[PDB]
């Protein structure tokens, strides 16, 4: 639950700059610039946060100190591998609603970190019920799971 | 050689739409449109060719009839799935020189399709030479290739 909390804050931070780059790409005129150096320089001046895109998309085995220690130490690769497919308005609606779902999930996570008698006590009851119904289904199908 | 000639012509056709889209997308302003159907409509209303991008860039086991039969009958995925990294000036320069290299290679392919005695007569001499020196270098190292 603590790892999920850190990753959700960092993903909110990532996608609520993709949204403003999509909104300001016409005023920004990215085609005018020479290479990745000048583009990263002109993106650092307009208030875009440097991020580590690989650790945010795939945090494989990173502990939480590793995850908040090398996250803000990257570049603008998150914003520069955007396809022109996703500069469209339905893509904007899709990203805004998934940001809303992520922050609702973040509120749910930080509410789950407090409950009695220890944090994460309802999720484990749900998983007990899921394991029980999978065992019952397996015992009925002669462990063939038809 | 017939397969290579066909794929080179089709890839010249594919990239000499992407380069002028990079030249004209600053004022085409695809960020203004709602979804990808309106975008595909307004891209087809300015003369961009519909292409099958997943078979131009990777012809695996397609014969030349089903290469020139179903590849000009695709969509605008080649042009809508461009990253914003691609819109810089150095990437334009690299695509221009890559178009030049493919044009030179297409000229070489049509030049050595017509040679005597049969098409591809010097290429097989070169492969004779490469196999012979690889056999020598394998015999010198007790077939361990140090």
UniProtKB/TrEMBL annotation, chains A, B:
Compartments where found: Host cytoplasm
Top-rank taxon, per record: Viruses
Family per record: Belongs to the type II topoisomerase family.
Function: Type II topoisomerase. Processively relaxes supercoiled DNA. Displays DNA-supercoiling activity only when associated with the viral histone-like protein.
Protein name: DNA topoisomerase 2
Encoding gene (name): P1192R CDS
Residues of the full protein shown: 1047 to 1192 of 1192
